Amino acid sequence: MGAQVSTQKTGAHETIIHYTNINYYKDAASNSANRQDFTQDPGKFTEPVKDIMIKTMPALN
Amino acid sequence: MGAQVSTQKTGAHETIIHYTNINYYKDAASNSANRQDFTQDPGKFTEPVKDIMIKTMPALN
Amino acid sequence: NLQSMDAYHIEVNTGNYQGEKIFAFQMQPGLESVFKRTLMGEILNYYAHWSGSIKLTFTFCGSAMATGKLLLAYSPPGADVPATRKQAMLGTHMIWDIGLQSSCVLCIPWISQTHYRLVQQDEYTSAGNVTCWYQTGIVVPPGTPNKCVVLCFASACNDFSVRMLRDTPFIGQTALLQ
Amino acid sequence: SDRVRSLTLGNSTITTQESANVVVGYGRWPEYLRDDEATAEDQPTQPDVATCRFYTLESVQWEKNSAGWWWKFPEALKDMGLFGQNMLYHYLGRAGYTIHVQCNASKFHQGCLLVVCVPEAEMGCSQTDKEVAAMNLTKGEAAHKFEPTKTNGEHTVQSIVCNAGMGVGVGNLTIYPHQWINLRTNNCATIVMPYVNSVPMDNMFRHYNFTLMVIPFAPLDYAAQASEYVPVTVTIAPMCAEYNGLRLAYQQ
Amino acid sequence: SDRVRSLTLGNSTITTQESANVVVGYGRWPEYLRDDEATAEDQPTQPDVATCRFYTLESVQWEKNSAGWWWKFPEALKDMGLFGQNMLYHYLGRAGYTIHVQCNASKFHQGCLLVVCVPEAEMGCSQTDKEVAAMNLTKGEAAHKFEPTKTNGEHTVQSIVCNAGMGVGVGNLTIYPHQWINLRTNNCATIVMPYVNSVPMDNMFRHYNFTLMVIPFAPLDYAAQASEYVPVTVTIAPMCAEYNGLRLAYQQ
Amino acid sequence: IARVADTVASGPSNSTSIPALTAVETGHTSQVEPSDTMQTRHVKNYHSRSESTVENFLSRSACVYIEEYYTKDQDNVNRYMSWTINARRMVQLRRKFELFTYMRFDMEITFVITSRQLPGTSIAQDMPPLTHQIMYIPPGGPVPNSVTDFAWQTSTNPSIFWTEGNAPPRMSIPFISIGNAYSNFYDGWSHFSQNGVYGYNALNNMGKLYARHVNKDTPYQMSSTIRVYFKPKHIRVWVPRPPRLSPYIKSSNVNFNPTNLTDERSSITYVPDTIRP
Amino acid sequence: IARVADTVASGPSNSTSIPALTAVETGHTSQVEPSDTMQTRHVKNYHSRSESTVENFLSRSACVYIEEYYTKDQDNVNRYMSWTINARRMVQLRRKFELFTYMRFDMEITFVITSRQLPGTSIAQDMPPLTHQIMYIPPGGPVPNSVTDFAWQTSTNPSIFWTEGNAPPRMSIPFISIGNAYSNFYDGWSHFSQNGVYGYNALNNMGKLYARHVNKDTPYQMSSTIRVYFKPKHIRVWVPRPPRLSPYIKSSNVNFNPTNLTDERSSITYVPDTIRP
């Protein structure tokens, strides 16, 4: 089938950890949640300044 | 098996979106609806004229 | 006229009628009583969402001797309905000149904020109004009618589309038929 | 068939099934001001579709005794949508304009109008000893009309047609961009006027770039029971509208 | 020196010798609507320099007991030059805006303001059992002010500062595009807001895209003989202004 | 795939091109678009007519019938159901099917059977789960005259046995019509002498459907209500037509009462003022 | 993958580097870390922000509504449910959604329907399993006015038929909003004259949801309680905002009562002594 093997979340016996998935429905809205999308970009809220500010330097000068 | 992978309808997280299907019954009447047949030809009802009419021109002349 | 062919008749007369509004209505393809029952609107009532432009074709049914120019305007939501020709003329309009070509199309462009609109249009998803006026007037020779009929046609464009499947509110019953 | 024509500017469209070609100013077509001809250093504003669209003015009635009418632009469009708003807020302006005069009758009516665009149509006063008042030269979209006889007004314009209120012969106005509306063949008249002036730009309230005159040379006539109401509507659309010198709106 | 900065939009220019960088919305800079995101089929109008310029609103006085102020846009600019004219004549609008709040004092004065831009700043009513009136939400370039105590008005906004009239904590407003005006280091605050909405465009009279709030966290203070008049002026300039749906002006 | 047409960017115009002018007399529907009568901007329209498909439109279970049958043999209550299959007794689905003259498709039939115990003073029971039997009888097959008729042997007729509590019974059926397509409208007669039956009933004959309780008897009177649902799939439709305007009166013909073309209003120029600051 | 930043080993310092000094006036949040203001040791941090994802945060079924409807037609008890869909009547889920201004996502809807028999002196029954029907009616569709209205024919409106005992009914729905994203806050009006409805209700319109018992009638009065659950998936959120501080009063607006910024305490220097040997 259109099987798609992904990686499972670390277990309590770490340091065959993968699962299989197949969509049965025609609408993408039927698929399960995307609990594995780990994107980040705090810059939008933490550093929305026009002029890049270097940590080790004075904010104003 | 006789699996057949198709494309799913766009989801609310666009811009692995495919599903698998296998028929289990011997009669085609048992299969699911054909919700993905997008054919069109309005000409039958909107332009059933014998002489092609060019938009940018006079209907009669 | 709810049960006569006069319901489709849009009279136009000879003589001074400047400042007079020939007709007007809202742009609710599925809610407006004017479109509510047309092939177009009749289908929209099986859906809750709609989008696209509309083609309002007007046909002059007067005599071959009658002449005239009408101003077909369309005003997007936001201001009051055009009370004068000047106000209507400020919006998307089409000056139709009656002649050999009987029909004239007034394509109402899809100028909405959102991509779709509800067939059960509310003030939020307002579409605007359409008002018709006399650009000049209807001049006619002697021995010729002074009142003429102007039919109106409505249909969707190649950019039209419905979206939310629902049941039409134009059919029901109180018990199984027999 | 060159009889039928269609005009599209902005959100406006005009239709015709009985036109007679299209006169294009002095062979030129409206165009924006070039850098090698500009003077105003500030970057101009170009509303485009916002101001460059068809504006219909108050219709006029053509009667068996009508002597003529005249409008002055861009003044006449001071209260027309955004085109008029830019005139108020800006010191300098520049536009093209597409004049489209409509007037239909029937194969049983007769008459002939003369649609002309007269650049710098400086007019004279009724009383040669006095001066004229702006109020008598142009009054918004309201048209001033020519009279078949001499006028007497204090500061009125010498409306006597034969002299077109300019001290010249009406039969020679054909030297300006024009067209006729011979009811037996016509139905309207279109003229595309290019920006004509001795300066790249100019104020639009203080200066009346050109005057549109509609003078009938063939009196409107018809038989009994024939529609007696024959209106003449004027529609004009600015082209390549540019504006400079933005400031507080001018109080009319 | 990054202290000094200059802003130029249209025929307007702002100067500063004591700024603190420039906050750019949510990392985005104002941009015109793309074809793959547009809905309105009609060609939009872009006055550019005509509407995209710095508009200064009525100044406000900062007092030792001032609790704050707030403005709602684009509504607050309904009577500002041509930007307001396009709002009247058009059904749809879209703009960027460059908020620039000015407020100078001296090395002997003290205080700290919080200049913030709150998208969809839906506010509550004084009387939780009733509703609010547009007149109490935004009144042109006239600023509404927050109160250090609870309000009682029938259809008034709960001006009590601590809740910012939104039922939240004022100390958390820092999650919105903002800057502070700490008199001992600042002199002004600039914020470039990009078009933020769940729709490509929207009406500019019916919808208040964002609210500008200036709330002081450090009370204005000073000694005797020290200028007691400390005004706070707000200047804003639209960016990438687009308009659709041209029709008869809306009667306010 | 089923995407909608995009709008080409259009600019000023002044030619002999007359896309706005036409003549409906030809029976031709104008193919004009906004860009033809005004200045438009380019717009990449991603909208899709995927839900306007005749398949997605008609492929949805809709109730077509409903009858009640009792368990005990008291009074003149029917202990079994009988039904001459057709979709003309439920205005909703009937109106959709009638948007087209001819139809061809397979169909998914679902049954929603529910029971109850009729009111009473002393009705303390303990009845086991009720099992039902739905039997389809194609035209000509023997019809049962009782809840114990030999016909319920279902020797060759398709039949379903369902017990309450479980998911509603379902099963698909092909294209039964003896014609090349189902007919929603038949402007003809059953007899060559132009008389007898007129319309639908003149040719359509999908047979009958019977139901009953397989349980012998209940201490106290109980009744069950079966609801039949139709869901056409693998659809094909021909010759579209004006939607039903007048309310449905009979389920055997198209009789109707002169109905209004639409709702009324003040005047042709009436438009409600919704802007009042 | 979604791992956290490690701490670089830092040693003594004595330079013109001022990572600790800054100016909040810029609206810039300091990006300092322990290693910048002290001597730190290297630490391979394996922690992950996998559960802080907007997906994992909002993707959890939360109750959004609850109503009760009876079986028998006695007194003025509603025999069916009606509901103008929205998530503003349950503070819990409503507060989360309101952490962001705009949202976009598909959704999994689950229904928990439970029944009961109202108290009485003589209520001995034997009612078969109760079957329910939940029908979604998008804006404009015909609304039923009784438990026997024709609207329940579900000709094209999505509907579910569930019998007690089985797993709670469920079904997914895409992104309905006519806009490019759901709006939790709308600082505008419904009318251009700046009046009428203000806020959420001014534009949101997800339609209505109706429920009922498909069973004809019960000997003695019984009632059922339906609980609707929402679980957004394939989530997208924009413009974060200050969490709700004041309690929710109305479900149509953001009205509130002046609430305290936080709990109180003795003094700014108050810290409980927890070390008392």
Ligand SMILES: CCCCCCCCCCCC(=O)O
């Ligand atoms: C086993 C049950 C068989 C039921 C047959 C139903 C056939 C439906 C045909 C509908 C015809 C029409 O709608 O024109």
Ligand SMILES: CCCCCCCCCCCC(=O)O
């Ligand atoms: C078939 C049932 C349909 C229910 C539609 C629910 C839509 C929920 C939308 C929530 C909008 C919001 O929270 O801002």
